[PDB]
From a paper:
[name] is highly expressed in the liver, where it regulates lipid homeostasis and methyl metabolism. The native ligands of these receptors are likely phospholipids (PL), as they have been crystallized with a variety of PL in the binding pockets.
To understand how RR- and SS-[name] differentially affect [name] activity, we determined the 1.7 Å X-ray crystal structure of SS-[name] bound to the [name] ligand binding domain (LBD). Strong electron density in the binding pocket indicates that the ligand is bound; however, modelling its precise position was challenging. In addition, no single conformation of the ligand is sufficient to account for the electron density in the binding pocket. However, the ratio of ligand/ protein B factors is 2.1 ± 0.4 with one molecule versus 1.63 ± 0.07 with two molecules modelled in the pocket, a significant improvement (p = 6 × 10–12 by two-tailed, unpaired Student’s t-test). The two SS-[name] molecules are also positioned very differently from each other: the hydroxyl groups point in opposite directions. Instead, the SS-[name] hydroxyl group is within hydrogen bonding distance of [name] residue M345 (conformation 1) or the backbone carbonyl of S383 (conformation 2). However, the complete absence of density surrounding the hydroxyl groups for both conformers suggests that these interactions are unstable. To explore the potential for the SS-[name] scaffold as an antagonist, we examined its proximity to the [name] AF-H. Both dominant binding modes of SS-[name] orient it such that portions of the molecule are within 6 Å of residue L532 on the [name] AF-H, which is in the analogous position to ERRγ F450.
Residue numbers in the entry:
A (entry chain C): 742 to 753
B (entry chain A): 300 to 526, 530 to 538
């Protein structure tokens, strides 16, 4: 789940 | 009085007008884009509405006490286990606060007549929505309030049914302390309803059951070609 990881990691 | 732990949970609550305003605005530009002959099906727009609600749920969790101390892989496992439960609990509480007979209140701030939705939703969704409405009625009769709602949110998020966690002790501890704070809060603020704590806790397996059956139905609709973040959560 790259999208979920991105939403948890993104800075903005 | 309010246990200090519940006050900390209440801090983490999102700005609900801005959350709802942002989702309302998103759905409007998507429809405004589409031409006469590419309208969204009613089910399709509800999926997009649920998709955008999920974005706000992830942002809520990521900034919440306790959750923000987990490593991201632990965070993913928790959200993959409870995302549909959180959507259903949010829907149910919205009806408890704002619901009127014969209508459903959406995360966009719109009120829609039940007869309109029930005409289009199909037998399975109508059954799950009626099961959820039975929970709304029970919770309203118990005077379900915002402090109890945020407790149930964290009890859903920090599920003891999630495996392979690096920090299962934190999930176990949050589950225990939120349970203890809810037991204390109901005793202090609703001393005459002995049944309230237990009635609240017993809605959690019911919400879980509605949520998982909802996931299974949505997976069916996706495999059928009828349906973003929503699809990603279904696959994982
Ligand atoms: C029918 C729904 C739905 C349709 C497609 C995809 C997701 C939801 C609603 C009902 C109307 C709201 O506009 C949706 C929103 C919503 C909450 C999220 C459910 C998704 C969990 C997998 C609803 C709901 C309520 C009770 C039982 C079943 C569904």
């Amino acid at each position: 789940n790259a999208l979920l990881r991105y939403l948890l990691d993104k800075d903005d | 009085s309010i246990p200090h732990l519940i006050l900390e949970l209440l801090k983490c609550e999102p700005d609900e007008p801005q959350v709802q305003a942002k989702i309302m605005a998103y759905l409007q530009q998507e429809q405004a884009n589409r031409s006469k002959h590419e309208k969204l099906s009613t089910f399709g727009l509800m999926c997009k509405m649920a998709d955008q609600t999920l974005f706000s749920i992830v942002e809520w969790a990521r900034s919440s006490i306790f959750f923000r101390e987990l490593k991201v892989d632990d965070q993913m496992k928790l959200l993959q286990n409870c995302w549909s439960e959180l959507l259903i609990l949010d829907h149910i509480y919205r009806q408890v606060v704002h619901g009127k007979e014969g209508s459903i209140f959406l995360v966009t701030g719109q009120q829609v007549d039940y007869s309109i939705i029930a005409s289009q939703a199909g037998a399975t969704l109508n059954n799950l929505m009626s099961h959820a409405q039975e929970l709304v009625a029970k919770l309203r009769s118990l005077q379900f309030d915002q402090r109890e709602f945020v407790c149930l949110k964290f009890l859903v998020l920090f599920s003891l049914d999630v495996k392979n966690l690096e920090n299962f002790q934190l999930v176990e501890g949050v589950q225990e302390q939120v349970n203890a704070a809810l037991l204390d809060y109901t005793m202090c603020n609703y001393p005459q309803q002995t049944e309230k704590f237990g009635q609240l806790l017993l809605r959690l397996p019911e919400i879980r059951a509605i949520s998982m059956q909802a996931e299974e139905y949505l997976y069916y609709k996706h495999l059928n070609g009828d349906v973003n973040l929503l699809i990603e959560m279904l696959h994982a």
